[PDB]
Amino acid sequence: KWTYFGPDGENSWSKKYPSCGGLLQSPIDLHSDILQYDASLTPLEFQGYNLSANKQFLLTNNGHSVKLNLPSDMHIQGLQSRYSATQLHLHWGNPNDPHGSEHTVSGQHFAAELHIVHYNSDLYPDASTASNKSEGLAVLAVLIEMGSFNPSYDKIFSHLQHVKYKGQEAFVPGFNIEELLPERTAEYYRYRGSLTTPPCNPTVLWTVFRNPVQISQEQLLALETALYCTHMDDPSPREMINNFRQVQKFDERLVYTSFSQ
Amino acid sequence: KWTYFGPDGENSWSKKYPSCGGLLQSPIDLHSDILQYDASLTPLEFQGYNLSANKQFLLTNNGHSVKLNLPSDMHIQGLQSRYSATQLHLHWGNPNDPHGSEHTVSGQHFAAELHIVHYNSDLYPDASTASNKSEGLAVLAVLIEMGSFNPSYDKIFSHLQHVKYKGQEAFVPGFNIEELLPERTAEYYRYRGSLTTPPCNPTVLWTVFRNPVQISQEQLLALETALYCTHMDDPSPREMINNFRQVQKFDERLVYTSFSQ
Ligand SMILES: CCCSc1c(F)c(F)c(S(N)(=O)=O)c(F)c1F
Ligand SMILES: CCCSc1c(F)c(F)c(S(N)(=O)=O)c(F)c1F
Ligand SMILES: [Zn+2]
Ligand SMILES: [Zn+2]
Asked: In the UniProt entry, which residues are flagged as the active site (chains A, B)?
């Protein structure tokens, strides 16, 4: 299958996933020349993010990232349709170059990036059906930098020990996913783009929050060193690192901002 | 018929040109995490760069860039073989976004980039042979920023309305090519990489000078509006703009610097 390195890496995804060589590809560099304040971009409302402490949510190593399944009563309010959550996951670099966000800001990577994936549940029955359809998906992106310890991110990272290898699964008790969001969620970048992984469908409404979150140096190192892409029994193990796509060309287009200041 | 934009752009190159999806791809972002000083990287000497003004050298629009043919008596001294020149060419952006270098430094693009292409003439009889052999080619890269008018670059640019279309050829009087190089050529980045266009062979020893040169806004605009990828009779003309590849992953690779600091 597809990978982020070697022969099956991102320059080859378009052979078997043609949309990876098509229009509206993500991620992109967010830089001042292409930003345009749009007073119409009002705050999102995060509904059902306070997950029941009494419910468990499936965490998976899928060989590409670590993903947490989310329930479809969790949703964003504010967009043209209701977009219901389906999963969250992360992208990161490696300890020798700990700059593995997908989006960049003025050419600079952040340490990592969290994506909370939602689908248009007013139009489609599930995310897998929505993903290749018009208006199918909305992703929230949180940029992550090393700083202070983050107890909320640790509600996910304390389980990394149990999803070390591809295919492994663990259960995470519900917690308030809004705790993973940064300060001043009113401030964000917005643009139409794509999945950043195969099949790269150009069906994502992106919201990248302006302000990053922090996690400690030990948390970032844990994220970068805890997982493998490969199955446990693989005689040639591969660490799960550098699981981000390079930025894409983005020309004659704008990213709209909810902030002018 | 590869291009820099649209269906046949760079995410699709690897469909026809397998090395574009292979190892050792160029260009790259030059940033601190991947740099290491190497005291062995001693100064290059540029020999036979002062081309006779009474001779002329062929300028050709090859559908992807503009190239100036260079004589094989022009060479670099200081590498492990003699590398003789074959051609130079440029990469650039567009009038509304004059940010088209290939290499970036700490996430920033420069306005344009000059490549002076050499081949190992000790080992091979011509650059096309050398180009499919490891370390067969050595390319010098000069980063170009918007700044003062540059008379020396204008010795090339003044001939562009004469090679606007694919297949057209002009003659440029000899001049001193060293005038295209920046200050303190002793300061450079060195790494093993590839051609930045199809067929992307991983056969280039790159030298990117630390210091940029300047050309004016007017020179950039001329460059960015002069040229077409297509023939003069093509009913579907395409402007030669934005002819730079995105930066490539470079992990496990290190870039060696002839400067500490
Ligand atoms: C079918 C529903 C989830 S698949 C998926 C995905 F894996 C992503 F990485 C992304 S990403 N990285 O673009 O957020 C995504 F948007 C997705 F939709
Ligand atoms: C002998 C090789 C002919 S094709 C070629 C080239 F000459 C370059 F200089 C480059 S560059 N841009 O790497 O200098 C390139 F990409 C090419 F594909
Ligand atoms: Zn993602
Ligand atoms: Zn070039």
From this structure: 64
